[PDB]
Each structure stands twice: as C-alpha cells, then as structure tokens.
C-alpha cells in the first residue's frame, strides 16, 4: 500500500516507506491571471522539476529543538535559476519531499514543516510549530515526508530577489537513539519541485 | 562493473557517484550482455534500453539511489547529484519490492544511431548514464546488482559481421 511515485516534469521519485501527501493551506493555486500583471504573464513548464539539497546531519548529540531551515527559493543553477535572473516577477507553489534514511532499529522523531514568512522562533514557540503544514519522520515507521503548498503572499507576483515567502524547516522532536544494529548518523536530504511557475516582465540582458 | 562484478557496493565517502557508463552497445560495462551480443552483428539501432536495478541487502539496511541520463553536449560528466539532478533522472528507495526499472530513452538527432564507437574521437555521440547513491543507512557492504535488456520499441536494422576469424 505504502508505495508512492511522484512525477514532476521529466523526473520521478519512488518511495516504498511513504505515509501520504500533506496539502498545506489549500489543494491548488488561486487565480493566476490578475489585474496587476496586465495579462502579460506566461507559464514556464520547463522549470517544474526536482532539485536536491542537503539539510543537516542528524546525529545523537542534537537535543530537542534543533531547528534547521531552508528559505525557498534557494540558489538554483538550472532553468529556475535563469528564470529568477531573467524575468522580473515570478510566482510558484512548492512540492517538497524530505528523506532521512537510517534503519528500522533507530529511534527518534523529526518534525518537517513548511513555514510562511519565516521569523526566528523563541525557545518557547517551538512547542507549537505543529500549526504549520507538517509531517513526521520516524525511523520506526517511515523515511519520507511529503508536503505540498500553494503560493501565498501579500502580492500576487513576487520578486524572489527581495522576498522569499516559504521556508522548509526540520526540528528534532525526539533525539536519535541508536543501538548496535542501527545507523550511527543520519543525513537529511531534501527534494523540492516548483509547480505552476508563472513569470512576467522580462528584463534586459547582461551579455 | 570493475573487476568483473555485476554489482556496485555502497561506498562510505563524500563522493556519491556509484558508476558511470556510456550509452553505446559497445561500451565496456555492456561487453558481456546478450543485448550487445546481438547488436555487434548489426549496423544501426533505435529505441529505449531498460536497466533493472535489484537490491541485495539485508533487512536491517536501507539505501536511496538515483539514476540520471546525461545527454551529449557537456564536457565533463557530473560528479554529484546536486548537479546531475537537472537531467532526466529517477530516484528510488529500498523496501518490500527490491527492483527498479529505468528506461534509458532514445534522444538523438538522426533517427538511427551506430552501434560502434567510430574512431579515437572521445565524448560518445550518445550521452552517458550515471548511477548515484543519495544516502544509505547501515549498509556497509551490501550490494546492488545491475542488469540491462531491450525496450518495448528497440530495433536493429542492418546485418553485418565484423568479428575477425
């Protein structure tokens, strides 16, 4: 039952220890054409594909409350990187998938969430981080968290040079407990894919 | 693969490129397969080529692999998944079902392509394929067996016999 296969563009991702997909704050995009862009917007289907990233090394020394973030979008080299630098205004939702493979004899729990409009959390607010679109990663049950969120912001189109709405966040809810037959460290990798990449207002070249 | 083993072992390193081979029915990694055994007697080919990866680890070890098809045009093949992730790739985990099938597509200018590397010219006319290892958990020695077979629309065209007697 727990065999999932996510396909974006011409790339795929299969997982045999999945727990489900978590839709955060909506199931789809709002109206993409608006009165501000004056209908001079287009869609770039070539950008909607995965790109990998490295979050952190989940060791045994990190206690409750270790918070590791990734402000999206990040420094991208593919077609998305050129889109950020070539068109003035962009908008896109995210489809994020985080994997932390140990083996079934470890223990511990990761809270993987997506936070809009990141702001540094005080040691007390971290107890309510579960208000956001989130899942859990527990080597007892699963090894893959899969969240998907639309584009939400005060402006219909944004300038990702100045304002980065979403932030992927991973917190260690229960520290890793290892045995003689469990992994001694875990490496948490991320796999993110933009969806509905709309662009508007092309810029002059630097060549 | 190296030393004539059909499996690649999980490596403990910061470099996570398990293997890399040219998409050419004369490649060194395909020198023993039945598919190349046929294709050596034909002039041109066309179609998709399937690769089957089978995990052979113990129940207490996990891993997550990725295979990407790097087309021709790049000078140096990528050496890390963060960079090769932009090609046509596929990722898979290890669980109950231990097999994974990836269809190396046929993407090239001419509708048919040769089955022999022409001359001392390098950088194969068809691109490489790189099998990476994203991460692994408590799999120190456990292997991954790789096999190759024909696709749903593979086709060989012109009969020859180049083997010297």
């Amino acid at each position, epitope marked *: 039952d727990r065999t999932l296969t996510t396909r974006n563009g011409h790339t795929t991702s299969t997982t045999q220890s999945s727990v489900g997909v978590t839709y955060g704050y909506s199931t789809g995009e709002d109206h993409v054409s608006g009165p501000n862009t004056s209908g001079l917007e287009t869609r770039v289907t070539q950008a909607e594909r995965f790109f990998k990233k490295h979050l952190f*090394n989940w060791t045994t020394d990190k206690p409750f409350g270790h918070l590791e973030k990734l402000k999206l979008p990040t420094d991208h080299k593919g077609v998305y990187g050129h889109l950020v630098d070539s068109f003035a205004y962009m908008r896109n939702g995210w489809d994020v998938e985080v994997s932390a493979v140990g083996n079934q004899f470890n223990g511990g729990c990761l809270l993987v969430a997506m936070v809009p409009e990141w702001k540094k959390f005080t040691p007390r607010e971290k107890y309510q981080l579960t208000l956001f679109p989130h899942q859990f990663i527990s080597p007892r049950t699963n090894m893959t968290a899969h969240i998907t969120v639309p584009y939400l912001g005060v402006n219909r189109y944004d300038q990702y040079k100045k304002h980065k709405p979403w932030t992927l966040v991973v917190m260690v809810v229960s520290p890793l407990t290892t045995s003689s037959i469990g992994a001694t460290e875990i490496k948490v990798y991320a796999n993110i894919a933009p969806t509905h990449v709309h662009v508007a207002g092309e810029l002059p070249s630097k060549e | 693969f190296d030393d004539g083993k059909p499996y690649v072992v999980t490596r*403990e*390193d910061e470099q996570r490129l398990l293997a890399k081979f040219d998409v050419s029915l004369a490649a060194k990694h395909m020198s023993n397969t039945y598919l190349s055994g046929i294709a050596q007697y034909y002039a041109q080919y066309s179609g998709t080529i399937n690769l089957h990866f089978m995990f052979t680890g113990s129940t207490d070890s996990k891993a997550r692999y990725m295979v990407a098809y790097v087309p021709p045009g790049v000078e140096t093949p990528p050496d890390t998944p963060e960079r090769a992730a932009h090609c046509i790739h596929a990722e898979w985990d290890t669980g109950l079902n231990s097999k994974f099938t990836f269809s190396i597509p046929y993407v090239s200018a001419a509708d048919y392509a040769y089955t022999a590397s022409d001359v001392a010219e390098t950088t194969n006319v068809q691109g490489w394929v790189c099998i990476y290892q994203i991460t692994h958990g408590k799999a120190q020695n456990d292997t991954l067996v790789v096999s190759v077979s024909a696709g749903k629309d593979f086709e060989l065209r012109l009969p020859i016999d180049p083997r010297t007697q």
Partner: nanobody, 119 residues
Framework: QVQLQESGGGLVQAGGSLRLSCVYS?????MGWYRQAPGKQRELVAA???????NYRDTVKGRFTISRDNAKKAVYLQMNSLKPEDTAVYHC????????????????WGQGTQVTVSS
C-alpha cells in the same frame, strides 16, 4: 568537502611508539590512514568504519591500532613496535569499503604529519 587536520608525528628510535591524531569536520564517513613512503606510491595502512569494524594492511597488522571518537570527532592511530620502514608522511581522510581497503582519491589532502623512525 572536509577540513581535517593531523598531529602527533615526529622522531623516535627503533622499537618506540607514537599516537597520531586527526580531527575532521564533515559527517561520519569511514576514515583511514594513508602513508607516502619516500619514493613510493601512497598506500593505505589501516581503516575504520563508522563506529565499529577495523581493517589493517598485511605488513602493519598486529602492531598498529586504529580507534575512533565520534563525540570529539577524532581518529587515532597507535603505532607500536616501529621499524625503519615505517617512515613517511601520514595523511588521513575518507576511505571506501574498509573490507577491501580501497582508498579514495577524491580530493584535497592536508599535509600535517611527518614521522621519522631512526636506527
């Protein structure tokens, strides 16, 4: 990829002993000790896994002892019953497949340890 430093080498007579230490910064990959004999190729000596199994070269087997400390992020090589042959520069960095002992020509090395056994 990793920034790692070595220390502990020096000069000693035949039959002495030494303790080489190395400190690294990235992850928990299986480390090992390499030596470049004067005028010979760089060769692996002893390798250790991630919190566990160790493996030694044929010549240095039984006289050396490698150990790891995960908390301090350090690896140690205790050298006993030294011989004039063991003089070299003892580098340390990651190693793949400590069973077969296949070293990694991956990247940059740090030259920090020089051992000179006398006789």
């Amino acid at each position: 990829q990793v920034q790692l430093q070595e220390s502990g080498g020096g000069l000693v007579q035949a039959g002495g002993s030494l303790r080489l230490s190395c400190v690294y910064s990235g992850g928990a990959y299986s480390m090992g000790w390499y030596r470049q004999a004067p005028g010979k190729q760089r060769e692996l000596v002893a390798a250790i896994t991630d919190d566990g199994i160790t493996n030694y070269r044929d010549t240095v087997k039984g006289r050396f002892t490698i150990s790891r400390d995960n908390a301090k992020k350090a690896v140690y090589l205790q050298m006993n019953s030294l011989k004039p042959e063991d003089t070299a520069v003892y580098h340390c960095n990651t190693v793949r497949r400590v069973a077969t002992l296949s070293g990694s020509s991956s990247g940059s090395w740090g030259q920090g340890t020089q051992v000179t056994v006398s006789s």
